[PDB]
Amino acid sequence: GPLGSCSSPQVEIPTTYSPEKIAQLQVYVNPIAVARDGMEKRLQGLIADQNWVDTQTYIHGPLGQLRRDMLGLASSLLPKDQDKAKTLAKEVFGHLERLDAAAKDRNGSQAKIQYQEALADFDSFLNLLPQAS
Ligand SMILES: [Zn+2]
Numbered sequence: 001g002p003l004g005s006c007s008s009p010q011v012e013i014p015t016t017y018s019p020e021k022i023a024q025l026q027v028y029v030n031p032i033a034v035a036r037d038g039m040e041k042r043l044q045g046l047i048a049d050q051n052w053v054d055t056q057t058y059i060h061g062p063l064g065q066l067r068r069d070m071l072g073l074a075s076s077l078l079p080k081d082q083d084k085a086k087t088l089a090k091e092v093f094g095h096l097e098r099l100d101a102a103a104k105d106r107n108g109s110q111a112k113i114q115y116q117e118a119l120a121d122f123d124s125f126l127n128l129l130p131q132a133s
């Protein structure tokens with residue numbers, strides 16, 4: 001009889017990134033680093049100036065693709081980090097929606113807290129990258 005095994009191949013978990021995998025990941029990191037830098041520079045200042053109208057446009061425009069980008073990055077990580085990274089992508093989106101609502105409410109204290117919480121979870125996510133090790 002046929003010699004091949006019919007059992008599930010258990011090609012186990014990689015726990016380091018190959019250059020391929022790292023170049024592939026970089027395709028998502030690029031726009032995500034742009035968004036992280038823009039949140040630090042421009043969005044911060046817009047909140048500080050109580051410029052609520054431009055705050056909201058910033059979230060919808062420059063950050064409008066960030067959920068999609070982070071979710072694509074997350075699904076590309078080592079299996080070990082995929083779920084945590086996905087959960088963090090969803091947390092950042094959540095704080096940006098709470099941010100947009102604070103801008104609508106012209107509540108600068110609430111806006112600053114959601115901005116900080118969005119950055120804390122964004123930086124948590126970024127710390128899963130081979131860049132932070
Ligand atoms: Zn959060």
Ligand SMILES: [Zn+2]
Pocket residue numbers: 056060100
């Ligand atoms: Zn909105």
